[PDB]
Short mmCIF file of all heavy atoms in Angstrom, two decimals:
data_model
loop_
_atom_site.label_atom_id
_atom_site.label_comp_id
_atom_site.label_asym_id
_atom_site.label_seq_id
_atom_site.Cartn_x
_atom_site.Cartn_y
_atom_site.Cartn_z
N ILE A 397 30.04 24.17 68.20
CA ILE A 397 28.85 23.35 67.96
C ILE A 397 29.19 21.88 68.22
O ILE A 397 30.20 21.37 67.73
CB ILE A 397 28.32 23.56 66.54
CG1 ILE A 397 27.91 25.02 66.35
CG2 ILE A 397 27.14 22.61 66.25
CD1 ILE A 397 26.74 25.43 67.20
N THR A 398 28.40 21.24 69.09
CA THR A 398 28.58 19.81 69.29
C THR A 398 28.02 19.04 68.10
O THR A 398 27.28 19.57 67.27
CB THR A 398 27.90 19.35 70.57
OG1 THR A 398 26.48 19.41 70.39
CG2 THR A 398 28.33 20.23 71.77
N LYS A 399 28.36 17.76 68.03
CA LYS A 399 27.86 16.99 66.91
C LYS A 399 26.38 16.64 67.08
O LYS A 399 25.71 16.37 66.09
CB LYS A 399 28.71 15.73 66.74
CG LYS A 399 28.09 14.44 67.18
CD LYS A 399 29.20 13.42 67.36
CE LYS A 399 28.63 12.06 67.59
NZ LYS A 399 27.73 11.67 66.46
N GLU A 400 25.86 16.74 68.31
CA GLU A 400 24.42 16.62 68.52
C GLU A 400 23.68 17.86 68.04
O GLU A 400 22.66 17.76 67.35
CB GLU A 400 24.14 16.36 70.01
CG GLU A 400 24.68 15.02 70.52
CD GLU A 400 26.17 15.05 70.84
OE1 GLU A 400 26.69 16.15 71.14
OE2 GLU A 400 26.82 13.98 70.81
N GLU A 401 24.19 19.04 68.38
CA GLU A 401 23.62 20.27 67.84
C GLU A 401 23.72 20.31 66.32
O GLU A 401 22.82 20.83 65.65
CB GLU A 401 24.31 21.49 68.46
CG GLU A 401 24.08 21.64 69.97
CD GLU A 401 25.00 22.67 70.62
OE1 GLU A 401 26.15 22.82 70.16
OE2 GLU A 401 24.57 23.33 71.58
N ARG A 402 24.78 19.74 65.75
CA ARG A 402 24.89 19.70 64.30
C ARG A 402 23.78 18.87 63.68
O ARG A 402 23.25 19.22 62.62
CB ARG A 402 26.27 19.17 63.89
CG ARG A 402 26.59 19.34 62.42
CD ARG A 402 27.87 18.61 62.02
NE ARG A 402 28.13 18.76 60.59
CZ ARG A 402 27.78 17.87 59.67
NH1 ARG A 402 27.18 16.74 59.98
NH2 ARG A 402 28.05 18.13 58.39
N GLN A 403 23.39 17.76 64.33
CA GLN A 403 22.28 16.94 63.86
C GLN A 403 20.97 17.71 63.91
O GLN A 403 20.13 17.60 63.01
CB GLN A 403 22.13 15.66 64.69
CG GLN A 403 23.06 14.51 64.33
CD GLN A 403 23.05 14.20 62.85
OE1 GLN A 403 23.95 14.58 62.12
NE2 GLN A 403 22.01 13.49 62.40
N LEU A 404 20.77 18.48 64.98
CA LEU A 404 19.59 19.33 65.06
C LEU A 404 19.56 20.32 63.90
O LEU A 404 18.51 20.50 63.26
CB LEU A 404 19.56 20.06 66.41
CG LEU A 404 18.75 21.36 66.55
CD1 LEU A 404 17.27 21.14 66.24
CD2 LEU A 404 18.92 21.92 67.95
N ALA A 405 20.71 20.90 63.56
CA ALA A 405 20.76 21.88 62.47
C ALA A 405 20.53 21.23 61.11
O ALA A 405 20.01 21.88 60.20
CB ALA A 405 22.08 22.63 62.48
N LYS A 406 20.92 19.96 60.96
CA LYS A 406 20.59 19.20 59.75
C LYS A 406 19.10 19.21 59.48
O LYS A 406 18.65 19.49 58.36
CB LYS A 406 21.09 17.76 59.90
CG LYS A 406 22.17 17.32 58.93
CD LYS A 406 22.34 15.80 59.00
CE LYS A 406 23.62 15.31 58.34
NZ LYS A 406 23.40 13.99 57.65
N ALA A 407 18.30 18.87 60.50
CA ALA A 407 16.85 18.90 60.37
C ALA A 407 16.35 20.31 60.08
O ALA A 407 15.40 20.50 59.30
CB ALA A 407 16.21 18.36 61.64
N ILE A 408 16.94 21.31 60.72
CA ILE A 408 16.55 22.70 60.47
C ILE A 408 16.81 23.06 59.00
O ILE A 408 15.95 23.62 58.32
CB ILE A 408 17.31 23.64 61.43
CG1 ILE A 408 16.87 23.39 62.87
CG2 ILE A 408 17.14 25.08 61.00
CD1 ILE A 408 17.71 24.15 63.92
N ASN A 409 18.01 22.74 58.50
CA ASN A 409 18.39 23.08 57.13
C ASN A 409 17.49 22.38 56.12
O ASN A 409 16.93 23.02 55.22
CB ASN A 409 19.86 22.73 56.89
CG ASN A 409 20.82 23.87 57.24
OD1 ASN A 409 20.43 25.04 57.31
ND2 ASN A 409 22.09 23.52 57.47
N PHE A 410 17.35 21.05 56.23
CA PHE A 410 16.57 20.31 55.25
C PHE A 410 15.07 20.53 55.41
O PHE A 410 14.32 20.31 54.46
CB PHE A 410 16.90 18.81 55.32
CG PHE A 410 18.27 18.47 54.78
CD1 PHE A 410 19.23 17.91 55.60
CD2 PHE A 410 18.58 18.72 53.45
CE1 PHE A 410 20.50 17.60 55.12
CE2 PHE A 410 19.84 18.42 52.95
CZ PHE A 410 20.81 17.86 53.79
N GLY A 411 14.62 21.00 56.57
CA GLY A 411 13.21 21.27 56.73
C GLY A 411 12.82 22.68 56.33
O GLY A 411 11.89 22.88 55.54
N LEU A 412 13.56 23.68 56.82
CA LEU A 412 13.13 25.06 56.66
C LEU A 412 13.39 25.61 55.26
O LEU A 412 12.77 26.61 54.89
CB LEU A 412 13.81 25.94 57.71
CG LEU A 412 13.32 25.67 59.14
CD1 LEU A 412 13.77 26.77 60.08
CD2 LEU A 412 11.80 25.53 59.21
N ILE A 413 14.27 24.99 54.47
CA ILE A 413 14.35 25.42 53.07
C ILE A 413 13.00 25.20 52.37
O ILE A 413 12.73 25.83 51.35
CB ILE A 413 15.48 24.72 52.29
CG1 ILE A 413 15.28 23.20 52.24
CG2 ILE A 413 16.86 25.09 52.84
CD1 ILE A 413 16.31 22.51 51.36
N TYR A 414 12.14 24.34 52.92
CA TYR A 414 10.80 24.15 52.39
C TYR A 414 9.74 24.87 53.21
O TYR A 414 8.54 24.64 53.01
CB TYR A 414 10.50 22.66 52.30
CG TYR A 414 11.49 21.95 51.41
CD1 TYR A 414 12.22 20.87 51.87
CD2 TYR A 414 11.70 22.39 50.11
CE1 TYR A 414 13.13 20.22 51.04
CE2 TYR A 414 12.58 21.76 49.28
CZ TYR A 414 13.31 20.68 49.75
OH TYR A 414 14.20 20.08 48.90
N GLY A 415 10.16 25.73 54.14
CA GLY A 415 9.24 26.58 54.86
C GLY A 415 8.27 25.87 55.76
O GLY A 415 7.21 26.41 56.05
N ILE A 416 8.59 24.65 56.22
CA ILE A 416 7.63 23.96 57.06
C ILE A 416 7.42 24.74 58.36
O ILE A 416 8.25 25.55 58.79
CB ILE A 416 8.06 22.51 57.35
CG1 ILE A 416 9.35 22.48 58.18
CG2 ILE A 416 8.23 21.72 56.04
CD1 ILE A 416 9.89 21.06 58.40
N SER A 417 6.27 24.49 58.98
CA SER A 417 5.94 25.21 60.21
C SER A 417 6.87 24.77 61.34
O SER A 417 7.64 23.80 61.23
CB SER A 417 4.48 24.98 60.59
OG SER A 417 4.26 23.60 60.84
N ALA A 418 6.76 25.49 62.45
CA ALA A 418 7.51 25.12 63.65
C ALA A 418 7.10 23.73 64.14
O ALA A 418 7.95 22.92 64.51
CB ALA A 418 7.29 26.17 64.74
N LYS A 419 5.79 23.46 64.15
CA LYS A 419 5.30 22.12 64.48
C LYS A 419 5.84 21.09 63.50
O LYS A 419 6.29 20.01 63.91
CB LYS A 419 3.78 22.11 64.47
CG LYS A 419 3.13 21.12 65.43
CD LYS A 419 1.60 21.28 65.44
CE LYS A 419 1.13 22.15 66.61
NZ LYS A 419 -0.34 22.10 66.85
N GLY A 420 5.80 21.40 62.21
CA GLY A 420 6.35 20.48 61.23
C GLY A 420 7.85 20.27 61.40
O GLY A 420 8.34 19.16 61.18
N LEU A 421 8.57 21.30 61.82
CA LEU A 421 10.01 21.16 62.03
C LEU A 421 10.29 20.22 63.21
O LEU A 421 11.13 19.32 63.11
CB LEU A 421 10.66 22.53 62.25
CG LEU A 421 12.15 22.55 62.65
CD1 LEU A 421 13.03 21.98 61.54
CD2 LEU A 421 12.62 23.95 63.04
N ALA A 422 9.57 20.41 64.32
CA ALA A 422 9.73 19.53 65.47
C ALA A 422 9.38 18.10 65.12
O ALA A 422 10.09 17.16 65.49
CB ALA A 422 8.89 20.04 66.65
N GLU A 423 8.27 17.91 64.40
CA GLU A 423 7.90 16.59 63.88
C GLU A 423 9.03 15.99 63.07
O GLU A 423 9.40 14.82 63.26
CB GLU A 423 6.63 16.70 63.02
CG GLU A 423 5.36 16.29 63.74
CD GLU A 423 4.13 17.05 63.26
OE1 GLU A 423 4.05 17.40 62.06
OE2 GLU A 423 3.23 17.29 64.09
#
Side-chain angles (χ1 to χ4, degrees):
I397 298 294
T398 70
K399 106 198 189 57
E400 294 81 25
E401 295 168 327
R402 191 189 178 264
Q403 279 309 102
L404 157 60
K406 244 192 194 216
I408 294 172
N409 271 339
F410 288 118
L412 291 193
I413 61 174
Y414 301 124
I416 65 184
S417 62
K419 210 174 262 193
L421 173 65
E423 261 149 33

